[PDB]
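Practice problem: predict the structure.
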Amino acid sequence: GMQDPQQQYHRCQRRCQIQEQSPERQRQCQQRCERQYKEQQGRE
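Answer:
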């Protein structure tokens, strides 16, 4: 249900690499992973 953190990290990047074709998408995925990553684990 909760799923492990390492799965979450791959999720933000997966979308990021697939849509990396467009520059704007890179910004949205980087922002999504940046915020999502912190939510996954604020520490480090």
